[PDB]
Design a protein around this nucleic acid. Structure first.
Ligand SMILES: [Mg+2]
Ligand SMILES: [Mg+2]
Ligand SMILES: [Mg+2]
Ligand SMILES: [Mg+2]
Ligand SMILES: [Mg+2]
Ligand SMILES: [Mg+2]
Ligand SMILES: [Mg+2]
Ligand SMILES: [Mg+2]
Ligand SMILES: [Mg+2]
Ligand SMILES: [Mg+2]
Ligand SMILES: [Mg+2]
Ligand SMILES: [Mg+2]
Ligand SMILES: [Mg+2]
Ligand SMILES: [Mg+2]
Ligand SMILES: [Mg+2]
Ligand SMILES: [Mg+2]
Ligand SMILES: [Mg+2]
Ligand SMILES: [Mg+2]
Ligand SMILES: [Mg+2]
Ligand SMILES: [Mg+2]
Ligand SMILES: [Mg+2]
Ligand SMILES: [Mg+2]
Ligand SMILES: [Mg+2]
Ligand SMILES: [Mg+2]
Ligand SMILES: [Mg+2]
Ligand SMILES: [Mg+2]
Ligand SMILES: [Mg+2]
Ligand SMILES: [Mg+2]
Ligand SMILES: [Mg+2]
Ligand SMILES: [Mg+2]
Ligand SMILES: [Mg+2]
Ligand SMILES: [Mg+2]
Ligand SMILES: [Mg+2]
Ligand SMILES: [Mg+2]
Ligand SMILES: [Mg+2]
Ligand SMILES: [Mg+2]
Ligand SMILES: [Mg+2]
Ligand SMILES: [Mg+2]
Ligand SMILES: [Mg+2]
Ligand SMILES: [Mg+2]
Ligand SMILES: [Mg+2]
Ligand SMILES: [Mg+2]
Ligand SMILES: [Mg+2]
Ligand SMILES: [Mg+2]
Ligand SMILES: [Mg+2]
Ligand SMILES: [Mg+2]
Ligand SMILES: [Mg+2]
Ligand SMILES: [Mg+2]
Ligand SMILES: [Mg+2]
Ligand SMILES: [Mg+2]
Ligand SMILES: [Mg+2]
Ligand SMILES: [Mg+2]
Ligand SMILES: [Mg+2]
Ligand SMILES: [Mg+2]
Ligand SMILES: [Mg+2]
Ligand SMILES: [Mg+2]
Ligand SMILES: [Mg+2]
Ligand SMILES: [Mg+2]
Ligand SMILES: [Mg+2]
Ligand SMILES: [Mg+2]
Ligand SMILES: [Mg+2]
Ligand SMILES: [Mg+2]
Ligand SMILES: [Mg+2]
Ligand SMILES: [Mg+2]
Ligand SMILES: [Mg+2]
Ligand SMILES: [Mg+2]
Ligand SMILES: [Mg+2]
Ligand SMILES: [Mg+2]
Ligand SMILES: [Mg+2]
Ligand SMILES: [Mg+2]
Ligand SMILES: [Mg+2]
Ligand SMILES: [Mg+2]
Ligand SMILES: [Mg+2]
Ligand SMILES: [Mg+2]
Ligand SMILES: [Mg+2]
Ligand SMILES: [Mg+2]
Ligand SMILES: [Mg+2]
Ligand SMILES: [Mg+2]
Ligand SMILES: [Mg+2]
Ligand SMILES: [Mg+2]
Ligand SMILES: [Mg+2]
Ligand SMILES: [Mg+2]
Ligand SMILES: [Mg+2]
Ligand SMILES: [Mg+2]
Ligand SMILES: [Mg+2]
Ligand SMILES: [Mg+2]
Ligand SMILES: [Mg+2]
Ligand SMILES: [Mg+2]
Ligand SMILES: [Mg+2]
Ligand SMILES: [Mg+2]
Ligand SMILES: [Mg+2]
Ligand SMILES: [Mg+2]
Ligand SMILES: [Mg+2]
Ligand SMILES: [Mg+2]
Ligand SMILES: [Mg+2]
Ligand SMILES: [Mg+2]
Ligand SMILES: [Mg+2]
Ligand SMILES: [Mg+2]
Ligand SMILES: [Mg+2]
Ligand SMILES: [Mg+2]
Ligand SMILES: [Mg+2]
Ligand SMILES: [Mg+2]
Ligand SMILES: [Mg+2]
Ligand SMILES: [Mg+2]
Ligand SMILES: [Mg+2]
Ligand SMILES: [Mg+2]
Ligand SMILES: [Mg+2]
Ligand SMILES: [Mg+2]
Ligand SMILES: [Mg+2]
Ligand SMILES: [Mg+2]
Ligand SMILES: [Mg+2]
Ligand SMILES: [Mg+2]
Ligand SMILES: [Mg+2]
Ligand SMILES: [Mg+2]
Ligand SMILES: [Mg+2]
Ligand SMILES: [Mg+2]
Ligand SMILES: [Mg+2]
Ligand SMILES: [Mg+2]
Ligand SMILES: [Mg+2]
Ligand SMILES: [Mg+2]
Ligand SMILES: [Mg+2]
Ligand SMILES: [Mg+2]
Ligand SMILES: [Mg+2]
Ligand SMILES: [Mg+2]
Ligand SMILES: [Mg+2]
Ligand SMILES: [Mg+2]
Ligand SMILES: [Mg+2]
Ligand SMILES: [Mg+2]
Ligand SMILES: [Mg+2]
Ligand SMILES: [Mg+2]
Ligand SMILES: [Mg+2]
Ligand SMILES: [Mg+2]
Ligand SMILES: [Mg+2]
Ligand SMILES: [Mg+2]
Ligand SMILES: [Mg+2]
Ligand SMILES: [Mg+2]
Ligand SMILES: [Mg+2]
Ligand SMILES: [Mg+2]
Ligand SMILES: [Mg+2]
Ligand SMILES: [Mg+2]
Ligand SMILES: [Mg+2]
Ligand SMILES: [Mg+2]
Ligand SMILES: [Mg+2]
Ligand SMILES: [Mg+2]
Ligand SMILES: [Mg+2]
Ligand SMILES: [Mg+2]
Ligand SMILES: [Mg+2]
Ligand SMILES: [Mg+2]
Ligand SMILES: [Mg+2]
Ligand SMILES: [Mg+2]
Ligand SMILES: [Mg+2]
Ligand SMILES: [Mg+2]
Ligand SMILES: [Mg+2]
Ligand SMILES: [Mg+2]
Ligand SMILES: [Mg+2]
Ligand SMILES: [Mg+2]
Ligand SMILES: [Mg+2]
Ligand SMILES: [Mg+2]
Ligand SMILES: [Mg+2]
Ligand SMILES: [Mg+2]
Ligand SMILES: [Mg+2]
Ligand SMILES: [Mg+2]
Ligand SMILES: [Mg+2]
Ligand SMILES: [Mg+2]
Ligand SMILES: [Mg+2]
Ligand SMILES: [Mg+2]
Ligand SMILES: [Mg+2]
Ligand SMILES: [Mg+2]
Ligand SMILES: [Mg+2]
Ligand SMILES: [Mg+2]
Ligand SMILES: [Mg+2]
Ligand SMILES: [Mg+2]
Ligand SMILES: [Mg+2]
Ligand SMILES: [Mg+2]
Ligand SMILES: [Mg+2]
Ligand SMILES: [Mg+2]
Ligand SMILES: [Mg+2]
Ligand SMILES: [Mg+2]
Ligand SMILES: [Mg+2]
Ligand SMILES: [Mg+2]
Ligand SMILES: [Mg+2]
Ligand SMILES: [Mg+2]
Ligand SMILES: [Mg+2]
Ligand SMILES: [Mg+2]
Ligand SMILES: [Mg+2]
Ligand SMILES: [Mg+2]
Ligand SMILES: [Mg+2]
Ligand SMILES: [Mg+2]
Ligand SMILES: [Mg+2]
Ligand SMILES: [Mg+2]
Ligand SMILES: [Mg+2]
Ligand SMILES: [Mg+2]
Ligand SMILES: [Mg+2]
Ligand SMILES: [Mg+2]
Ligand SMILES: [Mg+2]
Lengths: 77, 110, 203, 141, 59
RNA sequence: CUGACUGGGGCCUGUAGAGCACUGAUAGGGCUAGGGGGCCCACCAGCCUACCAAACCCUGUCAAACUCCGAAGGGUCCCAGGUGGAGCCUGGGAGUGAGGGCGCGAGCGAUAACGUCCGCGUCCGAGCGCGGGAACAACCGAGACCGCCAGCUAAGGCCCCCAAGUCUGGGCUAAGUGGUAAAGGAUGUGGCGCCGCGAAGACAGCCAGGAGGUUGGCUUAGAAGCAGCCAUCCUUUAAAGAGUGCGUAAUAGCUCACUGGUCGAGUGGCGCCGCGCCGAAAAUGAUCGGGGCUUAAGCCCAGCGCCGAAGCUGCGGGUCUGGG
RNA sequence: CGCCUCCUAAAAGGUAACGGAGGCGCCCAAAGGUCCCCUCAGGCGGGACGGAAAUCCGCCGGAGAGCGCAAGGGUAGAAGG
RNA sequence: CGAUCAACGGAUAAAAGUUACCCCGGGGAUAACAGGCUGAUCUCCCCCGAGCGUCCACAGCGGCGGGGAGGUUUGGCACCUCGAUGUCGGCUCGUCGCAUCCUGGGGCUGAAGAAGGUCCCAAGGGUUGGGCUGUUCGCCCAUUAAAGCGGCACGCGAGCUG
RNA sequence: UCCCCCGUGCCCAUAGCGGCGUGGAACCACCCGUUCCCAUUCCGAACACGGAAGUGAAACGCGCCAGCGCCGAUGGUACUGGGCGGGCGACCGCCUGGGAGAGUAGGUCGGUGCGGGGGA
């Protein structure tokens, strides 16, 4: 008697890293995610692993455009 | 259920908006050819130019080029220089190419 | 018949207090009004067991009105099997969707043979004038063998009452009875171990 | 007796038995019903024993409706092994049953017959039960 | 107006944040009374440790 | 002044619950490919099926690794309260890196363990200091600087051991239940509710009547209401089932059901609630902590009063810290 | 016994057990960049060989297909062809 | 560029076994005995009433299921004890429980009688000698009213045996 | 400032599917051609050019209809932050604050910005 199971992988610490209204700087990571759960919006880049980040210094804003998906914006200051 | 046309159109427009320029959008009907230079931040048109509105003549291509120059003129007069070319569902060719070259001669920046 | 029931208005009385006092919370509404009401449970229950959602209830309000209503929905307390809230639907002169009782007239052939009539629909949904509410709707089931069945299509409707459900909707059936002779072969019958849906490079 | 023909998973964590039945609370097919008064995992064998007794009461006749189904696998470690070394093996299947559920209904049989059958069936179940008969409340759900 | 708050049941055995609330209210000893401005932040802590406290409206 | 905690506001989330739209499970029914089987055939198509049954549909459900939904909460940021043995920064010194009980949420285990493994919280650890809990680290109460032959309380208590009520009003319990247990059983008791039947005289008793077809059969070998199911029809009735059981080898043999005379007021059955009864067997001598308690000294409801700690107060003192 | 994916995990992050299930130790010179174009599975109907399924035509079909490999997230307004 | 340094933060460039001949330091942080908690397993008792018993559920029985009690079994757990809680069987000496083996009392019986079965009350007393085996147990011989089953650290090694 | 149409956005189905109707002056489409630019793994179907005889048949635009789809109260309940009780347990309740999902009533055959072209 013994187990064929027993493994699991490290947690990846995914999810939003800066919420709406929060002041960010150019480069700040805003969202960490698998695929496009949030899409890059105004002043927001997407890295190869879908990571969303601020393109300019400013304030984070979220936007839910229905069938168009959810969006992270950064509004300049 | 979209069409190859509806898709093509989205696909190019989406790329153009992403860059944040004023967009020179082009409509090409069987007879005429129109041009809005649009600000998508504001959802607004800033300058127009049509073969319909210019009561312009004959050879469609030559006509296009004319609306092209026409657009640029009203455009620079409003301070607009740079802009992005929205070929819509249209291959950049023919009448559209012609319109594009015209706004170019006209001094539009793209 | 057509049944009558005293009703009363409630504002902020707590539904639990009401219930603790023998009163059943409820609401009456239609497109024009929506009022929070309660009834005496034991009175309501007396009516409702005959009424059901099938027959008209008239609500004798304290303001003096007397509104004709259908019970539209009854919430049961799932642990205790008791009503806990009623929806009274205020009939007005438009036609209404509703449930009209089926009567299964006659003894099916299948039942003589030892079978069992499964009264699958004991009522039927119907758009109809309030002024036109049938007491019931007869259905001849006497031609039913095990294992035949009737559908709403086979229903012969009264005047001014239109079907509100698919004609293809089965409404009664006659099925084989329970039999002790089946037990031994059921009790002996080898059943296979459950298959586990393959995960991974298996599928 | 009753068991899933197939499952996505072989073993299920145990869970809890809090609350009244989620649904299954009103009579919905036959004439008389057997409702659970207290929660339990009802075993497939217990279900089948309840059923068989009822058909036995009826001899020939009636319809029995079974409204609970054992899709929960019950696990147990082999005798005398110690703790650890993996989860037990499936030994049977239970149907989770919280208070209020109509577990069985009967139809097509006299009242004294539906009464007695459900009583005897009740004695096979490891919980307290009440026999109900179809009301308007059932019909209105 | 003002809130007169009195600590009357011991915070011993209650979660740290209720102890923290008493600290925000400045309540340190049983039976101690504190008169506090009746503002919404203060009222939040009074309501938080309501089962430990006796409140009375004053002036 | 930035802290814990709190107020307001934005954003993030996929749990409880629920749902079945997805993935799967699922009872029954409908509809209907596909098989099985029976008619009818090999000239290849038919037809019938109370058989197993796909997809689909309806009713009704199930799921940690399902979700069309989806809270309470939680997290974070902004503004504000918040001066605390708060917070932040640099540095010096550690010890710890065997935890444990309890509550809640899970997993494992057997819906076992004073079990095990995580999460949130608490307490013991280090509060084996104090009151209650008979006794008892972690349950309730409460954070012991010192002193007092002062006061008020907390949990818990107020018949005696034992401080304070043999306190007040309403109710139940007759089991010493209280003062350890389940399925299940029961004319225990009190209280509600719903049915039947009855002065067109019911129930009990003192009296009758219970009857033709017909010892009916799909019925073997007896099967005459009373060995299985797919029959309950009537004649005659004031009434009487092709019958409740006791009866036979099958009968015959009696009563009920059901109508009639006597009395003359209720009677029979179901269900629910409260408190009790049985179910209840273990090993040195018993026992609710003891004595002892029965309109309680038990239980439920509603009161007033007191007792009660190292908690709080009064009085005096010490030390540290802050402020004068 | 390292690494990945899901669950457990109590709706931020994290979270154990010899708890429940699966994968990795490669690969691709295109399976990479960019421009341009295209859109699926499946269902019904029609069509020689040709069948449940080869290719063709019609209608319906928002994504259930695809995306080298496990799972998950993502995704046709493309990441698919 | 050379790592299945995969025991995957990788001790050396380089490494398996045995000890009942054994030793030291430690641990009741951790097994084996006993106790404890638990009661799955075990023993006993009920609920249900299919069915058996010519007839007849319940004389005697009780399908499939269901609820419990006990704490003698086998285990689970790892809580005192590893600066020691001596461990099976026997002998000796008892003492207790009662789910009673006998004797006393009783109900039912498919109890004519005699003899039985089954349940109930009952723990006062009694409960044999021998062959086998270390055995407990068990089988066997010869008897008996009977040849009971358990607890007491699987009662009892500062009481003996070994 | 109102009506129609052509572009382009925003809300993200109350905007969709289906049935019916309607429009060609203008605009848009289909349309006529395939010399020319450009193009088909074949096809002027598409993309593309040059055109202006025809037709709103297709498409599109605008109306109407609630069969499907989508939206959806109020009421009550589940669940729950915090605070309390009960049960030997599985589990069950009270207080305060929050409060679904299903369902019922009901709603929907879109609303709106910018610029053009035409009309009153
Ligand atoms: Mg293994
Ligand atoms: Mg694992
Ligand atoms: Mg990790
Ligand atoms: Mg981990
Ligand atoms: Mg993970
Ligand atoms: Mg996130
Ligand atoms: Mg990149
Ligand atoms: Mg990439
Ligand atoms: Mg916003
Ligand atoms: Mg913005
Ligand atoms: Mg578990
Ligand atoms: Mg079980
Ligand atoms: Mg298990
Ligand atoms: Mg285990
Ligand atoms: Mg197991
Ligand atoms: Mg089992
Ligand atoms: Mg249930
Ligand atoms: Mg039972
Ligand atoms: Mg429902
Ligand atoms: Mg306290
Ligand atoms: Mg406390
Ligand atoms: Mg708290
Ligand atoms: Mg104090
Ligand atoms: Mg304190
Ligand atoms: Mg401050
Ligand atoms: Mg801060
Ligand atoms: Mg803060
Ligand atoms: Mg806050
Ligand atoms: Mg759930
Ligand atoms: Mg489903
Ligand atoms: Mg549905
Ligand atoms: Mg569940
Ligand atoms: Mg989950
Ligand atoms: Mg879930
Ligand atoms: Mg918060
Ligand atoms: Mg917030
Ligand atoms: Mg501040
Ligand atoms: Mg300071
Ligand atoms: Mg400190
Ligand atoms: Mg500190
Ligand atoms: Mg330091
Ligand atoms: Mg030092
Ligand atoms: Mg250290
Ligand atoms: Mg250390
Ligand atoms: Mg360590
Ligand atoms: Mg430890
Ligand atoms: Mg721990
Ligand atoms: Mg700790
Ligand atoms: Mg540990
Ligand atoms: Mg814990
Ligand atoms: Mg509790
Ligand atoms: Mg727990
Ligand atoms: Mg878990
Ligand atoms: Mg158990
Ligand atoms: Mg303890
Ligand atoms: Mg523990
Ligand atoms: Mg525990
Ligand atoms: Mg546990
Ligand atoms: Mg702890
Ligand atoms: Mg220590
Ligand atoms: Mg303490
Ligand atoms: Mg402490
Ligand atoms: Mg203590
Ligand atoms: Mg002490
Ligand atoms: Mg001490
Ligand atoms: Mg103490
Ligand atoms: Mg004490
Ligand atoms: Mg004491
Ligand atoms: Mg003095
Ligand atoms: Mg006092
Ligand atoms: Mg008190
Ligand atoms: Mg006392
Ligand atoms: Mg004494
Ligand atoms: Mg005294
Ligand atoms: Mg008194
Ligand atoms: Mg007694
Ligand atoms: Mg007593
Ligand atoms: Mg007693
Ligand atoms: Mg009784
Ligand atoms: Mg009673
Ligand atoms: Mg006779
Ligand atoms: Mg008893
Ligand atoms: Mg009294
Ligand atoms: Mg005192
Ligand atoms: Mg003090
Ligand atoms: Mg002094
Ligand atoms: Mg002083
Ligand atoms: Mg590795
Ligand atoms: Mg997680
Ligand atoms: Mg998760
Ligand atoms: Mg998480
Ligand atoms: Mg969480
Ligand atoms: Mg972090
Ligand atoms: Mg592997
Ligand atoms: Mg290529
Ligand atoms: Mg690629
Ligand atoms: Mg390429
Ligand atoms: Mg196809
Ligand atoms: Mg085909
Ligand atoms: Mg062919
Ligand atoms: Mg084909
Ligand atoms: Mg896919
Ligand atoms: Mg693979
Ligand atoms: Mg090397
Ligand atoms: Mg290593
Ligand atoms: Mg190594
Ligand atoms: Mg390592
Ligand atoms: Mg090395
Ligand atoms: Mg080397
Ligand atoms: Mg080595
Ligand atoms: Mg050895
Ligand atoms: Mg040796
Ligand atoms: Mg030797
Ligand atoms: Mg030697
Ligand atoms: Mg030697
Ligand atoms: Mg030696
Ligand atoms: Mg040694
Ligand atoms: Mg050493
Ligand atoms: Mg130990
Ligand atoms: Mg250790
Ligand atoms: Mg040990
Ligand atoms: Mg040991
Ligand atoms: Mg042991
Ligand atoms: Mg010991
Ligand atoms: Mg036990
Ligand atoms: Mg028993
Ligand atoms: Mg027999
Ligand atoms: Mg008999
Ligand atoms: Mg029998
Ligand atoms: Mg018996
Ligand atoms: Mg058995
Ligand atoms: Mg059991
Ligand atoms: Mg047992
Ligand atoms: Mg036990
Ligand atoms: Mg023991
Ligand atoms: Mg023992
Ligand atoms: Mg015990
Ligand atoms: Mg053990
Ligand atoms: Mg043991
Ligand atoms: Mg130990
Ligand atoms: Mg441990
Ligand atoms: Mg030792
Ligand atoms: Mg010693
Ligand atoms: Mg020693
Ligand atoms: Mg000793
Ligand atoms: Mg020895
Ligand atoms: Mg003895
Ligand atoms: Mg006895
Ligand atoms: Mg005797
Ligand atoms: Mg005799
Ligand atoms: Mg005899
Ligand atoms: Mg006897
Ligand atoms: Mg004796
Ligand atoms: Mg004795
Ligand atoms: Mg004896
Ligand atoms: Mg000899
Ligand atoms: Mg011998
Ligand atoms: Mg022997
Ligand atoms: Mg032996
Ligand atoms: Mg004898
Ligand atoms: Mg002997
Ligand atoms: Mg032992
Ligand atoms: Mg011994
Ligand atoms: Mg012994
Ligand atoms: Mg000994
Ligand atoms: Mg010795
Ligand atoms: Mg010995
Ligand atoms: Mg000794
Ligand atoms: Mg000794
Ligand atoms: Mg000794
Ligand atoms: Mg001796
Ligand atoms: Mg438009
Ligand atoms: Mg528009
Ligand atoms: Mg706009
Ligand atoms: Mg027309
Ligand atoms: Mg149209
Ligand atoms: Mg025209
Ligand atoms: Mg015309
Ligand atoms: Mg032309
Ligand atoms: Mg050519
Ligand atoms: Mg040319
Ligand atoms: Mg063409
Ligand atoms: Mg048309
Ligand atoms: Mg078009
Ligand atoms: Mg309308
Ligand atoms: Mg809804
Ligand atoms: Mg609501
Ligand atoms: Mg609440
Ligand atoms: Mg709570
Ligand atoms: Mg509320
Ligand atoms: Mg919800
Ligand atoms: Mg809702
Ligand atoms: Mg619509
Ligand atoms: Mg406009
Ligand atoms: Mg205009």
């Amino acid at each position: 008697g013994s187990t064929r199971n027993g493994r699991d992988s490290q947690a990846k610490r995914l999810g939003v890293k800066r919420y709406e209204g929060q002041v960010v700087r150019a480069g700040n990571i805003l969202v960490r995610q698998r695929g496009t759960r949030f899409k890059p919006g105004k002043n927001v880049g997407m890295g190869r692993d879908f990571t969303l980040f601020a393109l300019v210094d400013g304030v984070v804003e979220f936007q839910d455009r229905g069938r168009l998906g959810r969006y992270v914006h950064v509004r300049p200051l | 259920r979209l069409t190859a046309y509806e898709r093509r159109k989205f696909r190019v427009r989406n790329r153009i908006k992403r860059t944040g320029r004023l967009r020179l959008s082009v409509f090409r009907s069987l007879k005429h050819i129109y041009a809005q230079i649009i600000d998508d931040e504001k959802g607004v048109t800033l300058v127009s130019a049509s073969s319909l509105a210019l009561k312009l003549k004959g050879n469609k291509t030559e006509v296009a080029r004319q609306v092209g120059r026409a657009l640029a003129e009203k455009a620079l007069a409003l301070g607009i220089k740079q802009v992005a070319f929205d070929r819509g569902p249209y291959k950049y060719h023919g009448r559209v190419k012609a319109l594009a070259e015209g706004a170019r001669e006209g001094g539009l920046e793209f | 018949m057509e049944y009558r029931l005293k009703a009363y208005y409630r504002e902020g009385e707590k539904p639990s207090a009401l219930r603790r006092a023998g009163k059943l919370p409820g609401v009456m509404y239609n497109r024009h009004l929506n009022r929070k009401v309660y009834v005496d449970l034991v009175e309501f229950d007396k009516v409702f067991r005959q009424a059901s959602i099938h027959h008209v209830i008239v609500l004798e309000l304290p303001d003096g009105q007397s509104l004709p209503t259908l019970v539209r929905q009854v919430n049961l307390d799932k642990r205790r099997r008791r009503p806990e809230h009623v929806d009274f639907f205020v009939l007005s002169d438009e036609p209404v969707e509703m449930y009209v009782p089926l009567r299964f007239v006659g003894t099916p052939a299948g039942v003589r043979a030892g079978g069992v009539l499964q009264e699958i629909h004991r009522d039927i949904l119907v758009k109809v004038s309030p002024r036109n509410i049938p007491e019931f709707i007869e259905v001849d089931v006497s031609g039913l063998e095990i294992g035949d069945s009737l559908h709403a299509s086979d229903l012969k409707l009264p005047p001014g009452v239109e079907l509100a459900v698919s004609p293809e909707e089965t409404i009664a059936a006659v099925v084989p009875p329970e039999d002790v002779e089946k037990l031994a072969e059921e009790a002996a019958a080898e059943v296979a171990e459950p298959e586990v849906i393959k995960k991974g490079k298996e599928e | 007796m009753l068991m899933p023909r197939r499952m996505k998973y072989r073993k299920q964590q145990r869970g809890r038995l809090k609350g009244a039945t989620k649904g299954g609370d009103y009579v919905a097919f036959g004439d008389y019903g057997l409702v659970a008064l207290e929660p339990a995992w009802i075993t497939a064998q217990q279900i089948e024993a309840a059923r068989v007794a009822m058909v036995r009461h009826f001899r020939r006749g009636g319809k029995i409706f079974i409204r609970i189904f054992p899709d929960k696998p019950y696990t147990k470690k082999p005798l005398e092994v110690r703790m650890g070394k993996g989860k037990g093996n499936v030994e049977g299947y239970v149907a989770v049953v919280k208070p209020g559920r109509v577990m069985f209904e009967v139809a097509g049989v006299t009242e004294e017959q539906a009464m007695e059958a459900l009583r005897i069936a009740g004695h096979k179940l490891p919980i307290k039960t009440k026999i109900v008969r179809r009301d308007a409340y059932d019909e209105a759900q | 107006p003002r809130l007169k708050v009195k600590l009357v049941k011991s915070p011993i055995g209650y979660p740290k944040d209720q102890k923290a609330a008493l600290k925000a209210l400045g309540l340190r000893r049983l039976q101690q009374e504190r008169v506090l401005e009746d503002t919404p932040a203060i009222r939040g802590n009074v309501e938080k440790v309501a089962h430990l406290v006796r409140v009375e409206v004053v002036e």
